[PDB]
Amino acid sequence: GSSGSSGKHKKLFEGLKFFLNREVPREALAFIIRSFGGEVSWDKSLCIGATYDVTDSRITHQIVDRPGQQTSVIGRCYVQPQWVFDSVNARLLLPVAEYF
């Protein structure tokens, strides 16, 4: 791993943990969530460079193409990959209740 500071403690996704699936585009999301100072990981098997698995309660928000078909997990709230794009543009955390 690599350590280092960025500048200040002002990020839209400060601490917030996110997750991307093989269905949704990570190349875009990842780069984004990261640039916005957010945590994002993917399936180790899918591609190397991951930290936590999809079975880590730690995960606060989970991005998926079909949040309906697949059930949810206690504490964890699944949402579409559009919830993030709409947030970054609005520089605010939109109510996942709408994208659920």
Side-chain angles (χ1 to χ4, degrees):
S2 302
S3 283
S5 200
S6 65
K8 292 271 175 293
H9 286 230
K10 270 90 83 152
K11 294 290 186 201
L12 210 156
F13 299 138
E14 151 172 285
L16 271 180
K17 294 183 80 274
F18 283 90
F19 205 82
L20 326 181
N21 210 335
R22 64 194 280 180
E23 283 80 27
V24 314
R26 61 207 150 197
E27 59 178 274
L29 293 169
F31 161 79
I32 286 151
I33 301 152
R34 284 176 70 158
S35 83
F36 276 83
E39 273 314 297
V40 65
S41 187
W42 48 91
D43 207 70
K44 273 283 282 282
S45 177
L46 280 170
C47 274
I48 64 156
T51 48
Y52 43 89
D53 30 48
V54 59
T55 60
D56 208 324
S57 282
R58 282 191 276 167
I59 291 162
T60 67
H61 295 73
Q62 190 162 336
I63 308 296
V64 292
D65 208 353
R66 300 158 196 192
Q69 291 209 241
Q70 69 188 107
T71 58
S72 78
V73 183
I74 286 202
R76 189 150 72 188
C77 280
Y78 285 61
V79 301
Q80 279 201 34
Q82 191 194 332
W83 180 88
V84 179
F85 277 111
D86 285 47
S87 303
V88 289
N89 156 51
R91 300 90 85 79
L92 179 77
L93 298 177
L94 287 154
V96 301
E98 280 190 68
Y99 290 73
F100 179 96

